[PDB]
A and B are shown apart, each in its own frame.
Chain A
Amino acid sequence: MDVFLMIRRHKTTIFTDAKESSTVFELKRIVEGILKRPPDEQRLYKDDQLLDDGKTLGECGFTSQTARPQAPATVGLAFRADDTFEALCIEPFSSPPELPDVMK
C-alpha cells in the first residue's frame, strides 16, 4: 500500500511516496538521496513527535486513508547543526484572500 508524503523543513517541501510497510530509516535514505544529508543527521516527525528508525510508516499512522496523493501527510524534518540538532521549524505556506460575497 503506497503512502504519499510532504517532507518539510524551513522553506523546503519534498513530495514523495513510499510503502506503508517501509521504515522511517528507509524514508531518511530517500531524503539523503535528495538533500545529501546522511540519516544520522536527520530527525523525522509526525504531529511534533519524533519517529523511530525501525518503525514502519503504517505504525507511525501514515496509511492510504491519512496520506493520499491529493492530500499527502506532512513529515517534519530537522537537520543536525554541527554537534546538536536544530529545532523543528516548518515555515507556513501563504494564505488565500477573503472569500468573495458572490461565492458565499
Chain B
Amino acid sequence: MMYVKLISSDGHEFIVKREHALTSGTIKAMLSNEVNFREIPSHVLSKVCMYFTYKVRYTNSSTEIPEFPIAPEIALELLMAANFLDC
C-alpha cells in the first residue's frame, strides 16, 4: 500500500493513500510522494482528504450514497481549494 504526504500552509502533515490523493487532478499532475500547499490551511486540507476517501468509497458503488457534508463556515475556503485542486 503506497501512501503520499500532503502538507498544509500551517505545517500539518496528512498521510493519505496514493490512489486516493490522485482524485485531485492538480495532485495527479504533480505526482506524474510529498506535496506542500502554501495556500491551503489544515482545516480545509483535512476536509479535502475526507472527500478523497468519500470519492473512492462511493464512486460506482451499490450501497446508499450519503451526502458529503460541508459546514457553512468552511464552504468558501473549501470551494477555492477544490477549484485549485480540480476535484
- List A residues at the B interface (Cβ < 8 Å): 2, 4, 6, 11-17, 33-34, 68-72, 91, 93-97, 99-100, 103
Contact = CB atoms under 8 A, between A and B. Distances in A.
A95 B41 CA distance: 9
Given A93-B12, A99-B72, A72 B53 contact: yes
B25 interface: no
B34 interface: no
B13 A70 contact: no
Given A34-B15, A96-B77, A99-B73, A17 B43 contact: no
A72 B14 CA distance: 14
A103 B70 CA distance: 14
B15 A15 contact: yes
A13 to B, nearest CB: 5
Most B C-beta atoms less than 10 A away, residue of A2, A4, A13, A103: A13
